Amino acid sequence: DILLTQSPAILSVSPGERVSFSCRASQSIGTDIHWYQQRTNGSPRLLIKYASESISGIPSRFSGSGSGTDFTLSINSVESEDIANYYCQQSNRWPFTFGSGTKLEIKRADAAPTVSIFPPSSEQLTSGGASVVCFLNNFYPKDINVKWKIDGSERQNGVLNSWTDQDSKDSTYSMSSTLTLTKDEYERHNSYTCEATHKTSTSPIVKSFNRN
Amino acid sequence: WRCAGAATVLLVIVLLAGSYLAVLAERGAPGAQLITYPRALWWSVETATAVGYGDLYPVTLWGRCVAVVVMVAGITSFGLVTAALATWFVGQCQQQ
């Protein structure tokens, strides 16, 4: 069975640069290699067939080259929408096999997060629970840390965080921090605060709201 | 004598059926290369003409039975086509 090696597994690039993905087969497979793109939560999408043939609807900056065992996919001037996983696939011998994939990352200019805090909703409050949601959006680089404060004193219990992969629209990252408590514990406190500590600033970007 | 056209039609049918059945027989066997229709049709031509470069061939039993049919029917029908072409060329020899 044809083993397809995609090395390196991650590719970090500045915008507008040229990028090349490598696919190597364990034996010669002519030109029977095909390339696919898969964005976050998306289906695979065919980019190149038979090593170099273009597909209708794929930007001109995508091309491919190689024959035998060494194949490469190239992007002329990389752009934010190209952030995805890239897979090769061979059809020379049965069975068809896939490469392990290469992730494309874009190094963009630094960006501070846009922080927004949201108090629990009326509908959620009339059901027994309360969740305070904090959005930390469109920052770069990926490293960020959130701190929750209630009445000035920091809180750790009931906090659940989620991070997005690199955004295919602007190369930034985003994070949500949701603090979930009971309704009575929510109504037993005054000020709620999420504090964003990011590389872009020494002082933390914080947002607060008083229940009163 | 338009049954040379009938021989040509049989050959094309043999080539097409050979390509379809070869892919059907060869898929599922690890290492098989006779597994996509465009090059299977090229392999059928190679066999009906008995040229047999060896860039493609079946490795399964049913692929090899498919090949035997393409040999028997394909070499026969291709022989009728070239015989007709040769007789026609001998006819132009007579015109001088």
Next chain:
Amino acid sequence: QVQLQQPGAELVKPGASVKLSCKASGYTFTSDWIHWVKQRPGHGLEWIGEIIPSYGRANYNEKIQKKATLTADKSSSTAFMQLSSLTSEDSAVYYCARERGDGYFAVWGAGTTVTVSSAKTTPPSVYPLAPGSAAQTNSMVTLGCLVKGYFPEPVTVTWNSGSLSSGVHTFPAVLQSDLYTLSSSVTVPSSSWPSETVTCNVAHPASSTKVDKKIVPRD
């Protein structure tokens, strides 16, 4: 038109079975092969098997444990994959794809998220996320919605049924006590809201539920 249509999700009990379907449209030829590809979360693509509907023969990846059985029905133009005796290792997204007998996958389905678990299907609760009364307004305003306590994955969140594609983040779900929770955020020009309506649409295919929630200022 979407050429290969797959159900969004299937919940299977450990040890139980499921039949996934893939409904084809567009041009169909006798040379058509339907392929099935498995992708576990955070992993790559793994070829499961193939079937030629015009004849009915199927082949399977010999490197992995044989867990699937492929069939087709030419009348409904639908291919089926029977996944039997599933365990936790079989929880993945399962794509179908069409190959014109020429070696590449021109067209992929959207994939069926299969979760193997003994827990129960629960529809999500959707809550709006409007700014507090004291939040200062910039030139943009950020709204959101909270999708809490559902099972199994996934949910699909759109904003104004797709017309608000730009400025949207849907965060990956977080699992807690056998129930998932996520949030989605949208940013519009602040002069625009609430004079123009902003509504989130949350779909949960495992429960066949679809909910709309409008984001109004205050209550």
